[PDB]
Structure 1
Amino acid sequence: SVIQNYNKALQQLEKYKPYEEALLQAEAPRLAEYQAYIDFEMKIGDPARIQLIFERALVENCLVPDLWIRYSQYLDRQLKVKDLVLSVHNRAIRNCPWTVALWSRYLLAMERHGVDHQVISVTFEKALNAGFIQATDYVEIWQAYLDYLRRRVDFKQDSSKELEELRAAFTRALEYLKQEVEERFNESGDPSCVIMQNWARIEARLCNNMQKARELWDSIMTRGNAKYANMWLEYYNLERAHGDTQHCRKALHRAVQCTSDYPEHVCEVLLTMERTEGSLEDWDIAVQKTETRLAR
């Protein structure tokens, strides 16, 4: 009935009275009061109402990047409607462009919802030009675009336009960090060479090209990473899967020399492999080499 609906409507508006008084009694921007209302509405689960309360919060708190992330993450993971989703990712980067995450998030949202490559690759260029305060942010959005460009590749096909495209992008990214980021921050942004690491792992595991991965890892080590044991062991593990023992052997021998932080670990890893598959004189050579390092 007209009245039966009127009441059912009103009845379902009592639960929000505290949340509305909380807002009313509070002064602008009412952050904590909107935060609770968001917390509450999200537990209820009405998509229309959740969209509204986030929208209400933005009329007074669009300046806060985290609110955009909270709103976007909800649409990404729950509503999953391309139209309503991408709109907020567009608005997020328009309000808080300085925030890298927003761009990165926008890119996945676009990929998730199958937006054309021509379109996605253009958004990425806009990100590169937004302007972030620090070098790590430039690396972060490069990691994003390279993971996107990687997911386009069909590594079943030995050679392809997408793989060619992927490699060129890595080369562009690595140059971009050496030219633009170095000149602007007197720093690379990627000290452990994650971008290069990421490439060597693809090149080895998915392109049957250990030789590039070796060339790469020598550059990594050359950029001040030989002192670390974990860096040696990352390379070792890569060779152990997609390479051979001779190279594992020569590497761990060089690692005991170069390792500063944790030589005992490296030594033990060597002694184990020779115990697991090497000759006796190899096991002996190892014992001497490890001892010699541990002597100092």
Structure 2
Amino acid sequence: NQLEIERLEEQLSINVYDYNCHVDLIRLLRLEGELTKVRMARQKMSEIFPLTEELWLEWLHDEISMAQDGLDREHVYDLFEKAVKDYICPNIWLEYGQYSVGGIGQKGGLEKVRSVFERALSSVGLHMTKGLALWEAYREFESAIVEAARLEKVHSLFRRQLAIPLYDMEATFAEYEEWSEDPIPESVIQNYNKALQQLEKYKPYEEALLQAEAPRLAEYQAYIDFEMKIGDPARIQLIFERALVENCLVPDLWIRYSQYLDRQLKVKDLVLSVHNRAIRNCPWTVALWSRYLLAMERHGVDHQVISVTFEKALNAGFIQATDYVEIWQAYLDYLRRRVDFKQDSSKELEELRAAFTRALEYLKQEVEERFNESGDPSCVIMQNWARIEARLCNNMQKARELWDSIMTRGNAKYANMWLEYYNLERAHGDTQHCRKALHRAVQCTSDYPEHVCEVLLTMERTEGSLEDWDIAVQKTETRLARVNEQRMKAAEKEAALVQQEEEKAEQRKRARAEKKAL
């Protein structure tokens, strides 16, 4: 049996991203009874993958069976704390509540049990199908500690629940009437009726969810669309989380959720936790990383931790080269917003300039090596560096050095490219340099040459000397003449190929053998 464990152990050392291998290794260590090794393998899997409810539960059950010390109780609590983070988990919460009851009597045991049930209810108390079990477990505990006056607390739990649309809530209203010696107040009956109307209202979606199987993403989306029209922040979070349990590998769903959080709730601890979980579920999508870095910046996360997050993004592994420029650009935009441009020379500015160099080299080395295509064809990073360096810093010279480099890459043929450079020179350079840029455009542009000529003639018309206008008409006339010659000649060749294909089709008319022997 140990032979097979060693096989799995080495298979993980070659590739640690084999989820099923981790699962197989743990099941075997657990069988062999290696207790410190199972926990070690479980801590190592959990740091890499978010774990499903069933995997957390077996781990929780195992630590609980062996906890034999008051300290191990504390350790089990720490584990429960880890488990609730990955996805919504009504059974884990229920297990946490029931377990925490065992520490009653100790200094904070009564308060602790109330703390976890209350936390459970905030997370899963509105859950149509699995929320009810939590309310019932909470009430049962409260009634078990008191006989005559804490009764107000048990009342409150009955009243809190009956204002919420849950399944079999009807049996809970009846259970409450019998229990209560005091009459059920009119306000409670009205909150219950409105909760029943909500229950009838959400019933078709819950049923569509039930009849559909499985992950039932389309039915989840319809539900989410519905809850957003209604607009209860608490219900919208719930329905997102419910959907994300079965569809955690659908990045657009994470985007949708995090986007709602980033625009509406705007609660730091919540939005960032959700971004992080998106990252653990779908590391391969760059938008998730760039949106994470955005959220960290909006909420004043320390620069060091934002930076270390970015470094993790570079190591996630993406499928496209374009993906790597996107992550670099998000980080670069972030570094750019940290600089005070009102004053040269900022330490932050040198950090920015250092980052740009690093990005271009990273694009030159790592991405080019793996994909064998540059990840930035139109050199958009260099363009941004150039724009910044010329408009925000008084360093037009660096902008020029950059642009000469952008153009050498066969980018010299694009009208829009020359114009991007021209406009940069028109704003922060001199007229002499616009003219040289424009004279170059005319010489090099291959897609829309008439366009760049018009731009050159317009500049000379408005700002140049008569010699300048005359040189401009000469260069443009000459250039356009050459263009029209090749355009016209190539049309001669296509017309010549059509005539060759007509004389080929000609021989086929005069040679039509209706009978074939071969």
Same fold (TM over 0.5): yes
The number of aligned residues is: 296
Q: Deviations over 1:28-50 (max 9, x none)?
A: 11111111110010111100000
Deviations along 1:140-193, one digit per CA (max 9) or x if unpaired, are 100010000000010001110010000000000000010111111111110000
Deviation at residue 243 of structure 1 after TM alignment: 0.4
Q: Deviations over 1:46-68 (max 9, x none)?
A: 00000000011011100111110
- Report the CA distance between 1:13 and its aligned residue: 2.2
Deviates more, 1:57-66 or 1:9-18: 9-18
Dislocated runs of 4+, deviation >3 Å: none
Deviation of the 1:284 alpha carbon: 0.6
> 1:58-83, CA deviations, whole angstroms, 9 ceiling, x for partnerless residues?
11100111110010100001111111
Q: Distance in 2 between matches of 1:14 and 1:127?
A: 45
How far apart, in 1, do the equivalents of 2:369 and 2:219 lie?
Answer: 45
Higher RCO by CA contacts (8 Å cutoff, separation 6 or greater): 1
TM-score, structure 1 as length reference: 0.98
Work out the CA distance in 2 between the residues paired with 1:4 and 1:198: 61
CA distance in 2, matches of 1:4, 1:184: 65
Distance in 2 (alpha carbons) for counterparts of 1:33 and 1:124: 35
Report the Cα distance in structure 2 between the residues aligned to 1:269 and 1:21, rounded to whole angstroms: 64
Give the SS at the match of 2:337: helix
Cα distance in 2, alignment partners of residues 263 and 5 from structure 1: 73
- Which of 204, 215, 225 is matched with 1:29 structurally? 215
Give how far 1:11 is off: 2.0
1:84 to 270, 292, 301: 270
Structure 2 unaligned spans of 5+: 1-186, 481-516
Give, in angstroms, the shift of residue 17 of structure 1: 1.5
- Structure 1 position 8, deviation (Å): 2.2
Cα shift at 1:194: 0.1
Equivalent residue for 2:371, pick from 172, 182, 185? 185
Where does the alignment leave 5 or more consecutive residues of structure 1 unmatched? none
After superposition, the C-alpha distances for 1:97-136 in whole angstroms (9 at most, x for unaligned) are 0111100010001001110000100000000001111211
Rg (Cα) greater in structure: 2
1:59 and 1:103 map into 2 onto residues whose CA distance is 20
- Cα distance in 1 between the residues matched to 2:458 and 2:188: 81
Separation in 1 of the partners of 2:275 and 2:303? 17
**Aligned partner of 2:390 among 181, 204, 216:** 204
Q: Return the offset for 1:264.
A: 0.4
**In the aligned structure 1, how far is the partner of 2:199 from the partner of 2:270?**
26
Indicate the SS of the match to 2:200.
Answer: coil
In structure 2, C-alpha distance between the alignment counterparts of 1:13 and 1:156, rounded to whole Å: 59
2:471 pairs with 1:285: yes
Q: Distance in 2 between matches of 1:179 and 1:11?
A: 62
Name the residue aligned to 2:27: none
Matches within 5 A, 1:137-148: 137-148=323-334
Counterpart-to-counterpart distance in 2, 1:198 and 1:108: 18
Which region of structure 1 is more displaced relative to structure 2, 13-22 or 58-67? 13-22
Give secondary structure in 1 for the equivalent of 2:344.
coil
Please state if 1:130 is matched with 2:316. yes
SS of structure 2 residue aligned to 1:16: helix
RMSD (Å), alpha carbons? 4.4
Which string of whole-angstrom CA distances, capped at 9 and with x for unpartnered residues, describes residues 273-296 of structure 1? 101111111001000000010199
For 1:185 and 1:26, locate their aligned partners in 2 and report how far apart those are by CA, in whole Å. 41
Deviates more, 1:62-71 or 1:16-25: 16-25
* TM-score between both structures, scaled by the size of structure 2: 0.56
- The C-alpha deviation readout for 1:190-230, integer Å capped at 9, x for no partner, is 00000000000000000011100000000000122101110
Aligned counterpart, 1:44: 230
Q: What is the rounded CA distance, in whole Å, between the counterparts of 1:4 and 1:287 in structure 2?
A: 85
SS at match of 2:315: helix
For residue 225 of structure 1, give the secondary structure of its aligned residue in structure 2. coil
